[PDB]
Write an enzyme that holds these catalytic residues in place. Structure first.
Site, PDB file in Angstrom:
ATOM      1  N   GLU A  69     -11.723   3.983  -1.203  1.00  0.00           N
ATOM      2  CA  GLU A  69     -11.983   4.766  -0.062  1.00  0.00           C
ATOM      3  C   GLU A  69     -12.390   5.855  -0.398  1.00  0.00           C
ATOM      4  O   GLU A  69     -12.369   6.776  -1.377  1.00  0.00           O
ATOM      5  CB  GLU A  69     -10.222   4.414   0.707  1.00  0.00           C
ATOM      6  CG  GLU A  69      -9.453   5.760   0.225  1.00  0.00           C
ATOM      7  CD  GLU A  69      -8.281   4.890  -0.297  1.00  0.00           C
ATOM      8  OE1 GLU A  69      -8.183   4.190  -0.833  1.00  0.00           O
ATOM      9  OE2 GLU A  69      -7.242   5.769  -0.311  1.00  0.00           O
TER      10      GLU A  69
ATOM     11  N   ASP B 102       0.900  -1.199  -0.123  1.00  0.00           N
ATOM     12  CA  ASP B 102       0.127  -0.140   0.159  1.00  0.00           C
ATOM     13  C   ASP B 102       0.860   1.066   0.273  1.00  0.00           C
ATOM     14  O   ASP B 102       0.237   2.414   0.440  1.00  0.00           O
ATOM     15  CB  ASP B 102      -1.131  -0.094   1.388  1.00  0.00           C
ATOM     16  CG  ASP B 102      -2.042   0.685   1.119  1.00  0.00           C
ATOM     17  OD1 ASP B 102      -2.323   1.207   0.038  1.00  0.00           O
ATOM     18  OD2 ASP B 102      -2.833   0.982   1.919  1.00  0.00           O
TER      19      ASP B 102
ATOM     20  N   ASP C 137      -2.913  -3.069  -2.592  1.00  0.00           N
ATOM     21  CA  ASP C 137      -4.190  -1.972  -2.311  1.00  0.00           C
ATOM     22  C   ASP C 137      -3.737  -1.356  -3.623  1.00  0.00           C
ATOM     23  O   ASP C 137      -2.979  -1.226  -4.655  1.00  0.00           O
ATOM     24  CB  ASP C 137      -3.948  -1.320  -1.712  1.00  0.00           C
ATOM     25  CG  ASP C 137      -5.537  -0.101  -1.394  1.00  0.00           C
ATOM     26  OD1 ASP C 137      -6.582  -0.582  -1.823  1.00  0.00           O
ATOM     27  OD2 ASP C 137      -5.301   1.225  -0.534  1.00  0.00           O
ATOM     28  N   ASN C 138      -4.717  -0.591  -4.502  1.00  0.00           N
ATOM     29  CA  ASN C 138      -4.773   0.607  -5.523  1.00  0.00           C
ATOM     30  C   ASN C 138      -4.553   0.447  -6.673  1.00  0.00           C
ATOM     31  O   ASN C 138      -4.041   0.875  -7.685  1.00  0.00           O
ATOM     32  CB  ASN C 138      -3.633   1.873  -5.164  1.00  0.00           C
ATOM     33  CG  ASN C 138      -4.325   1.938  -4.189  1.00  0.00           C
ATOM     34  OD1 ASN C 138      -3.689   2.499  -2.769  1.00  0.00           O
ATOM     35  ND2 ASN C 138      -5.651   2.368  -3.188  1.00  0.00           N
TER      36      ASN C 138
ATOM     37  N   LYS D 119       2.790   3.265  -5.751  1.00  0.00           N
ATOM     38  CA  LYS D 119       2.479   2.715  -6.801  1.00  0.00           C
ATOM     39  C   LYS D 119       3.577   1.867  -7.200  1.00  0.00           C
ATOM     40  O   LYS D 119       3.199   0.526  -7.971  1.00  0.00           O
ATOM     41  CB  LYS D 119       1.392   2.958  -6.784  1.00  0.00           C
ATOM     42  CG  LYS D 119       0.192   3.551  -6.275  1.00  0.00           C
ATOM     43  CD  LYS D 119       0.044   2.827  -4.977  1.00  0.00           C
ATOM     44  CE  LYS D 119      -1.133   3.488  -4.418  1.00  0.00           C
ATOM     45  NZ  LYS D 119      -0.425   2.496  -2.503  1.00  0.00           N
TER      46      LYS D 119
HETATM   47  O1  LIG Z   1      -0.175   6.899  -2.293  1.00  0.00           O
HETATM   48  C1  LIG Z   1      -1.081   6.418  -1.679  1.00  0.00           C
HETATM   49  N1  LIG Z   1      -0.223   5.795  -0.586  1.00  0.00           N
HETATM   50  C2  LIG Z   1       1.478   5.415  -0.978  1.00  0.00           C
HETATM   51  C3  LIG Z   1       1.372   5.607   1.647  1.00  0.00           C
HETATM   52  C4  LIG Z   1       2.871   5.960   1.677  1.00  0.00           C
HETATM   53  N2  LIG Z   1       3.182   6.148   2.907  1.00  0.00           N
HETATM   54  N3  LIG Z   1       4.311   5.170   2.511  1.00  0.00           N
HETATM   55  C5  LIG Z   1       4.429   4.284   1.733  1.00  0.00           C
HETATM   56  C6  LIG Z   1       6.047   4.411   1.494  1.00  0.00           C
HETATM   57  C7  LIG Z   1       6.742   3.343   2.244  1.00  0.00           C
HETATM   58  C8  LIG Z   1       8.168   2.828   2.400  1.00  0.00           C
HETATM   59  N4  LIG Z   1       8.594   3.179   1.252  1.00  0.00           N
HETATM   60  C9  LIG Z   1       7.931   3.676  -0.353  1.00  0.00           C
HETATM   61  C10 LIG Z   1       6.949   4.533   0.156  1.00  0.00           C
HETATM   62  N5  LIG Z   1       4.194   5.032   0.683  1.00  0.00           N
HETATM   63  C11 LIG Z   1      -2.322   5.914  -2.263  1.00  0.00           C
HETATM   64  C12 LIG Z   1      -2.640   7.176  -2.714  1.00  0.00           C
HETATM   65  C13 LIG Z   1      -4.202   6.712  -3.273  1.00  0.00           C
HETATM   66  C14 LIG Z   1      -5.314   8.115  -4.021  1.00  0.00           C
HETATM   67  C15 LIG Z   1      -6.258   8.392  -4.877  1.00  0.00           C
HETATM   68  C16 LIG Z   1      -6.569   8.697  -5.831  1.00  0.00           C
HETATM   69  C17 LIG Z   1      -6.295   9.803  -6.055  1.00  0.00           C
HETATM   70  F1  LIG Z   1      -6.832  10.550  -6.891  1.00  0.00           F
HETATM   71  C18 LIG Z   1      -5.136  10.610  -5.192  1.00  0.00           C
HETATM   72  C19 LIG Z   1      -4.317   9.307  -4.196  1.00  0.00           C
HETATM   73  C20 LIG Z   1      -5.157   6.136  -2.947  1.00  0.00           C
HETATM   74  C21 LIG Z   1      -4.306   5.385  -1.453  1.00  0.00           C
HETATM   75  O2  LIG Z   1      -5.359   3.993  -1.435  1.00  0.00           O
HETATM   76  C22 LIG Z   1      -2.562   5.700  -1.641  1.00  0.00           C
HETATM   77  O3  LIG Z   1      -2.354   4.296  -0.393  1.00  0.00           O
HETATM   78 CL   LIG Z   2     -14.765   3.222   2.449  1.00  0.00          CL
HETATM   79 CL   LIG Z   3      -5.004   2.630   5.877  1.00  0.00          CL
HETATM   80 MG   LIG Z   4      -4.032   2.772  -1.101  1.00  0.00          MG
END
Ligand SMILES: O=C(NCCc1nnc(-c2ccncc2)[nH]1)c1cc(-c2ccc(F)cc2)cc(O)c1O
Ligand SMILES: [Cl-]
Ligand SMILES: [Cl-]
Ligand SMILES: [Mg+2]
Length: 213
Positions: A197, A139, A167-168, A142
């Site tokens: 979500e 998650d 996810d996603n 991407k």
């Molecule tokens: O970007 C997303 N998640 C990533 C969050 C992360 N946190 N830590 C790391 C990490 C950890 C270690 N290494 C690299 C990255 N990555 C994400 C974005 C969207 C989304 C959907 C539609 C939109 F219009 C805008 C955004 C939805 C989601 O469900 C997501 O999961």
């Molecule tokens: Cl939901």
């Molecule tokens: Cl989450």
């Molecule tokens: Mg996600």
């Protein structure tokens, strides 16, 4: 402040300490009524719950904790002694995740790591005493789903039957990951269609069960 801090405060003021379900409900209410956020959410979360209950994993790795919603969701269903390691790149969000888990009373089950997956995955065996993973929840960024899956394999962290749950895979989408796991004899794949979500936009989870080399 930030949206993530507002989510944490909302939980602290609208949920019951030590009650993970109330924490999930508070996050989902805030993100439906006040401000959208990229938590996995309740629709996809129910699919996650069904998978966790099927496999009862002893050791789970999560890539991309955000505010800890999915970590709360998974950790609340883990058996006594089972553990979750979760990785979050943003230090502010890592701290919020820790506080979220503390509030939920799940801190003894979860280790929250602050850093990049490509840096931390190779440290899991020696620094975090991991042998192999029972389940991985992808998650995070991407464009990292595919390279990190390959890295997990290289690092010897996958075994026959390790469950990857991603996810996603539709929005934002992970086309290279999907193509790869669906075309590889090393994975048995299933797609679980759902919704982004808090939105009426189609998304989904991919389960990819590792079959060995
Ligand atoms: O970007 C997303 N998640 C990533 C969050 C992360 N946190 N830590 C790391 C990490 C950890 C270690 N290494 C690299 C990255 N990555 C994400 C974005 C969207 C989304 C959907 C539609 C939109 F219009 C805008 C955004 C939805 C989601 O469900 C997501 O999961
Ligand atoms: Cl939901
Ligand atoms: Cl989450
Ligand atoms: Mg996600």
């Amino acid at each position: 402040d930030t949206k993530e801090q507002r989510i944490l405060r909302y939980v602290q003021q609208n949920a019951k300490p030590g009650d993970p379900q109330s924490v999930l409900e508070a996050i989902d209410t805030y993100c439906t009524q006040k401000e959208w956020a990229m938590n996995v959410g309740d629709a996809k979360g129910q699919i996650m719950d069904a998978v966790i209950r099927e496999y009862s994993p002893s050791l789970v790795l999560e890539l991309g904790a955000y505010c800890g919603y999915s970590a709360v969701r998974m950790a609340r269903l883990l058996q006594p002694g089972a553990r979750l390691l979760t990785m979050e790149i943003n230090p502010d969000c890592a701290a919020i995740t820790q506080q979220m888990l503390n509030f939920a009373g799940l801190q003894d089950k979860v280790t929250i790591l602050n850093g990049a997956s490509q840096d931390l995955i190779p440290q899991l065996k020696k620094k975090y005493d991991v042998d192999t993973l029972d389940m991985v929840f992808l998650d995070h960024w991407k464009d990292r789903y595919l390279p990190d899956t390959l890295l997990l394999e290289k690092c010897g962290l996958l075994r026959k039957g390790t469950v990857l749950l991603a996810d996603n895979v539709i929005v934002p989408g992970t086309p290279d990951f999907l193509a790869y796991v669906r075309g590889s004899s090393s994975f048995e794949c299933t797609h679980y269609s759902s919704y982004l979500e808090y939105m009426k936009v189609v998304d989904g989870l991919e389960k990819a069960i590792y079959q060995g080399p």
